[PDB]
Amino acid sequence: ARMFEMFNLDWKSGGTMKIKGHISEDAESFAINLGCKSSDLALHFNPRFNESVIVCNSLCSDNWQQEQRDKHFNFYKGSTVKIIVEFLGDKFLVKLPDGHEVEFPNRHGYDKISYLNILGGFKVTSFKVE
Amino acid sequence: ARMFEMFNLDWKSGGTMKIKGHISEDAESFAINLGCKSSDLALHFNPRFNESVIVCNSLCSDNWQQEQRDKHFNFYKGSTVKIIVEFLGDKFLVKLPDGHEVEFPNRHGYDKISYLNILGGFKVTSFKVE
Numbered sequence: 001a002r003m004f005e006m007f008n009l010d011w012k013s014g015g016t017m018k019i020k021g022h023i024s025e026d027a028e029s030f031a032i033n034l035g036c037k038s039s040d041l042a043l044h045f046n047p048r049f050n051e052s053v054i055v056c057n058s059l060c061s062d063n064w065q066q067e068q069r070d071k072h073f074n075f076y077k078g079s080t081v082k083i084i085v086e087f088l089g090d091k092f093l094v095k096l097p098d099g100h101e102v103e104f105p106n107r108h109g110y111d112k113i114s115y116l117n118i119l120g121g122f123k124v125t126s127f128k129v130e
Numbered sequence: 131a132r133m134f135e136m137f138n139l140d141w142k143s144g145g146t147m148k149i150k151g152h153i154s155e156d157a158e159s160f161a162i163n164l165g166c167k168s169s170d171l172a173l174h175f176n177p178r179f180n181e182s183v184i185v186c187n188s189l190c191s192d193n194w195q196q197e198q199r200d201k202h203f204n205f206y207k208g209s210t211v212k213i214i215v216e217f218l219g220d221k222f223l224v225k226l227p228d229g230h231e232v233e234f235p236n237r238h239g240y241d242k243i244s245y246l247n248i249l250g251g252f253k254v255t256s257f258k259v260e
């Protein structure tokens with residue numbers, strides 16, 4: 001379910017967002033979604049424990065686009081983790097705890113991200129945006 | 131007017147929450163609301179620029195209880211402000227940047243808070259809950 005939702009971010013290129021939180025002992029997945037509203041997302045970052053893969057995708061009027069899969073998966077159920085997202089113009093970059101970077105294109109050319117939600121087995125304990 | 135909403139907080143007595151953010155240049159008020167759901171609030175903390183007062187209250191099934199008004203008002207439109215809230219057994223203590231504390235009684239004897247929202251002219255930039 002919906003853990004966290006924020007509206008009216010005014011997050012722009014050069015922006016950095018730091019999300020720390022607890023992954024449920026029973027999690028099968030969680031997602032950090034960034035866009036302009038629930039049905040329009042620049043970045044859906046979704047670690048999936050069953051397939052041991054991080055899937056990224058974008059959502060356009062509630063239509064999912066073509067996903068990207070990263071098999072560098074060092075997430076653990078029951079743990080507290082820090083995820084850093086950077087809004088880098090033509091792409092998003094997600095830095096993981098092990099220092100791996102997941103890169104995802106800013107396909108639809110957002111210049112501002114106003115909406116965030118976090119769903120699934122992830123309880124936010126710290127959030128910072130600049 | 132809804133800016134930030136979290137569910138499943140699992141925040142318990144002895145916990146501390148830090149909410150720092152930017153008060154809109156054109157803000158008239160903002161509110162930090164903590165409780166069990168949007169209709170049952172242990173704490174509604176509402177600084178109002180049109181009255182220069184902080185109104186506090188609790189909400190019991192969409193009924194407001196007795197207001198507590200704090201005339202100590204050192205808030206400024208357009209500024210960034212850090213607010214700390216401590217969940218104690220008898221009360222919520224809200225620590226303000228200038229050292230003033232607002233003590234609001236824990237009228238409904240909550241020992242767990244699962245719901246937070248922030249409304250109005252306040253953009254969170256740093257949130258932490260423990």
Ligand SMILES: OC[C@H]1O[C@@H](O[C@H]2[C@H](O)[C@@H](O)[C@H](O)O[C@@H]2CO)[C@H](O)[C@@H](O)[C@H]1O
Pocket residue numbers: 174176185186187194197
């Ligand atoms: O008590 C919190 C509650 O206040 C409402 O506004 C009040 C106002 O504080 C009071 O002085 C006047 O007599 O009645 C108003 C309406 O009941 C707000 O509507 C609500 O948002 C809360 O902030």
